[PDB]
Amino acid sequence: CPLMVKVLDAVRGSPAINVAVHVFRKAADDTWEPFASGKTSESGELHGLTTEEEFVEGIYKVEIDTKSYWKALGISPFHEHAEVVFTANDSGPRRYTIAALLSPYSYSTTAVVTNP
Amino acid sequence: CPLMVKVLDAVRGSPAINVAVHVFRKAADDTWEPFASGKTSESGELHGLTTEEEFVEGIYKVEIDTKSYWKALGISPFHEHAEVVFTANDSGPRRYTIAALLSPYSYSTTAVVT
Amino acid sequence: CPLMVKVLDAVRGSPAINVAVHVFRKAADDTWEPFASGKTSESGELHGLTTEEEFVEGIYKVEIDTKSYWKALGISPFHEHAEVVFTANDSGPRRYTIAALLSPYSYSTTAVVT
Amino acid sequence: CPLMVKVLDAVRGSPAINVAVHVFRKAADDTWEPFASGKTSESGELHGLTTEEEFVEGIYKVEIDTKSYWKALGISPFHEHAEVVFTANDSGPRRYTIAALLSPYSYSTTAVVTNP
Ligand SMILES: O=C(Nc1ccc(Oc2ccc(Cl)cc2)c(Cl)c1)c1cc(I)cc(I)c1O
Ligand SMILES: O=C(Nc1ccc(Oc2ccc(Cl)cc2)c(Cl)c1)c1cc(I)cc(I)c1O
Ligand code: NA
Numbered sequence: 114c115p116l117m118v119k120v121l122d123a124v125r126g127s128p129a130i131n132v133a134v135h136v137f138r139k140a141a142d143d144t145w146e147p148f149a150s151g152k153t154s155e156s157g158e159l160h161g162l163t164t165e166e167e168f169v170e171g172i173y174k175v176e177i178d179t180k181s182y183w184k185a186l187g188i189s190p191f192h193e194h195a196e197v198v199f200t201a202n203d204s205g206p207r208r209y210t211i212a213a214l215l216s217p218y219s220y221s222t223t224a225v226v227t228n229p
Numbered sequence: 230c231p232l233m234v235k236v237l238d239a240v241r242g243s244p245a246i247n248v249a250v251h252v253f254r255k256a257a258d259d260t261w262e263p264f265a266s267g268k269t270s271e272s273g274e275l276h277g278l279t280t281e282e283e284f285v286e287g288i289y290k291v292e293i294d295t296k297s298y299w300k301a302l303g304i305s306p307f308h309e310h311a312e313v314v315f316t317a318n319d320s321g322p323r324r325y326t327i328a329a330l331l332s333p334y335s336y337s338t339t340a341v342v343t
Numbered sequence: 344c345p346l347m348v349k350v351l352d353a354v355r356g357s358p359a360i361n362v363a364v365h366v367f368r369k370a371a372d373d374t375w376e377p378f379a380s381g382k383t384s385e386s387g388e389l390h391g392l393t394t395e396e397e398f399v400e401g402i403y404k405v406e407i408d409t410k411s412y413w414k415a416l417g418i419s420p421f422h423e424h425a426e427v428v429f430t431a432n433d434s435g436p437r438r439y440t441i442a443a444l445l446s447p448y449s450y451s452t453t454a455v456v457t
Numbered sequence: 458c459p460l461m462v463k464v465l466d467a468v469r470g471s472p473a474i475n476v477a478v479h480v481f482r483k484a485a486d487d488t489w490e491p492f493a494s495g496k497t498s499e500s501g502e503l504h505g506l507t508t509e510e511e512f513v514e515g516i517y518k519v520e521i522d523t524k525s526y527w528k529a530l531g532i533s534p535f536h537e538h539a540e541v542v543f544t545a546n547d548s549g550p551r552r553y554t555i556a557a558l559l560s561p562y563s564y565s566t567t568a569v570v571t572n573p
């Protein structure tokens with residue numbers, strides 16, 4: 114599991130459950146190729162997106178569908194989504210955890226990068 | 230204006246208006262003594278807390294009454310308040326902006342020292 | 344000034360100066376077309392991006408070149424940039440401030456809509 | 458484990474390891490009574506602070522010694538510490554996770570509250 118995503122809800126003080134997450138990788142022609150997708154669990158975590166073999170060097174985009182999350186709670190939020198774009202594995206394989214903290218008009222994102 | 234406080238509301242996407250803010254300075258007996266007070270304006274800002282002459286080296290605490298702010302909006306908050314504790318003017322006067330971004334179960338605070 | 348961007352540096356406690364910012368608007372073919380551009384001032388602010396007449400309903404992307412900012416300081420960053428994507432003026436003109444707080448491995452963004 | 462603390466470093470993209478954390482509970486005379494303390498592990502997590510029996514209703518303060526953390530890294534930070542003050546267990550026992558994200562001139566804190 115070299116790529117994990119965790120999402121928290123700053124309004125309710127809870128994991129953000131059932132949030133859709135789409136991962137893309139920049140292709141040779143500069144377009145965003147679909148790479149993996151999933152949804153956060155009851156713990157707010159999304160595991161199993163990829164493998165060490167599949168998760169090669171590249172520029173990756175993680176798009177978290179925060180708009181659908183807020184709308185289901187009856188809230189009209191500001192952002193269309195929360196996105197994280199980063200170069201991965203440039204100095205060799207690493208494990209990446211992307212965390213996002215969500216409010217209707219704000220989000221914060223952080224990465225922890227570890228060397229296995 | 231060597232010390233300014235700005236408060237924003239991450240739920241409504243607005244300045245946080247009428248938020249009570251108390252500033253304390255640590256005294257020799259390690260007690261917090263009142264130093265300045267006010268409430269945020271319609272822009273979420275609190276100016277005129279102190280003067281350069283009064284704002285000397287020390288440890289300061291800025292206490293933002295976030296609980297009363299959320300209660301006024303009918304929202305149950307987690308924190309009793311948001312406190313920001315820092316050393317100021319330990320190398321002579323400086324200008325300090327303390328910004329706070331509020332959510333019911335989270336807050337962020339940053340300092341801009343110019 | 345219906346759209347303003349402010350960028351702060353959480354490592355140095357300062358405005359983030361000379362940060363390149365590009366604004367795009369989503370077109371009918373779902374491509375991002377250039378809409379406005381600039382760089383933050385010495386106060387970390389970018390004003391004068393658009394006018395009320397030009398800033399119509401649409402989906403907008405504000406792309407902040409955070410990587411170049413950290414590289415200029417000799418600091419290795421995580422993100423390629425910070426993007427903020429939002430729908431604006433879908434109920435008529437509004438005023439929008441997008442603030443971003445930057446750290447090498449983290450950023451926060453908030454909108455104040457007045 | 459009804460009270461857990463997690464601390465992350467936003468400059469390095471890592472857990473904040475060996476960070477001292479002091480917990481206090483407001484006493485009947487309005488003073489802060491020492492309640493528990495510990496330090497974050499190699500994962501940035503501090504477990505085992507208290508028990509269900511010990512962690513009664515009250516107003517609690519969690520003080521995270523961010524100044525010593527930054528100074529050990531050669532950085533002179535802004536804050537003396539990061540503190541979180543909250544009423545706990547008012548509607549019955551809950552589990553609290555307090556997370557803090559640290560930068561030299563900024564910190565963010567969030568709570569997740571769950572009902573066991
Ligand atoms: O933020 C993080 N971790 C976390 C985990 C659990 C937390 O609290 C609960 C409690 C119960 C439930 Cl069900 C869900 C969440 C909280 Cl507040 C925070 C986190 C962020 C990054 I970048 C990297 C790693 I590696 C992390 O671990
Ligand atoms: O965060 C800051 N500044 C800011 C200013 C304006 C903003 O947007 C509006 C728009 C209309 C209104 Cl009425 C209120 C707020 C937002 Cl969001 C943020 C800020 C934080 C620090 I540390 C230091 C300085 I120096 C700052 O400026
Ligand atoms: Na390489």
Ligand code: NA
Nearest residue numbers: 318319320321
């Ligand atoms: Na000194």
Ligand code: NA
Nearest residue numbers: 432433434435
């Ligand atoms: Na409309």
Ligand code: NA
Nearest residue numbers: 546547548549
């Ligand atoms: Na009760």
